[PDB]
Amino acid sequence: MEMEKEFEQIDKSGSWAAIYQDIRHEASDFPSRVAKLPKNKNRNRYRDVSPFDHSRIKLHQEDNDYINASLIKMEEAQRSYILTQGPLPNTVGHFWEMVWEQKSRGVVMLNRVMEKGSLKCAQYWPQKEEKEMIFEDTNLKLTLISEDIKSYYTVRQLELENLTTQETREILHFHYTTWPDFGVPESPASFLNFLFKVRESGSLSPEHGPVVVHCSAGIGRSGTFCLADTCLLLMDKRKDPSSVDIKKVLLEMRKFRMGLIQTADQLRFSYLAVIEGAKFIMGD
Ligand SMILES: CC(C)N1C[C@@H](O)c2ccccc2S1(=O)=O
Structure with a gap:
């Protein structure tokens, strides 16, 4: 079913809360035993948001390999993403x-x-060129190279040195920088413009490791970004773009990290972004 008609049907029936609860009910449940070990309590921002053991990113160190981060591997789309929490004061070194x-x-x-x-994540990058950051626990140096401030978003060039x-x-x-404190954006135009700037940079391409994506918990806004990107890429690749089922893509991504898309409003916004973005993908 063309998602644009599915969209109007759910809107006219006001059933977003019902569709969203159906996804919550069918979503995968896998163990997160490493996340819950007492040694890792100060590595988690939220008690109820943990990476599954099967898909968690391991740090390359014998001491403690744990970080709150998941590998989302989308086989048909040929895209991978790392979704992670906003870094905490004691995990900025792990993050880098x-x-x-x-x-x-x-x-x-x-x-x-x-x-x-309230603080939603640590100030984990340098704000001035001449004041670099050193992460003594992981032996890294991080320098601000340049900053381009736009109306909806900022792009920064950073230099990371393995000391x-x-x-x-x-x-x-x-x-x-403009997602509102409550709810979701009224139009997806600025969020799609932003997604296309990340794509144009090379950051999502297979010649590189996976993009790191975060918000505060790394499931809500972060889920919306990867869901919109993957659905648009599948509509480009397939003979029948109308065969792309956003609900089925979301359940596939929920095999790799719990809780992706946090509200019925975020689900509706994801549909809006894919519907408006497809009007480029299909040749405009
Ligand atoms: C081997 C090439 C394709 N690269 C891939 C990746 O390792 C990376 C990550 C950050 C900055 C630069 C580079 S890279 O251009 O050296």
């Missing part, structure tokens, strides 16, 4: 260790450091 080890080219940030008057080997890489930081 993961970027280095997984060979990512991009970091996508969908939250502000402060929202609703152990003196190798350096360029990391691109894509910061969507």
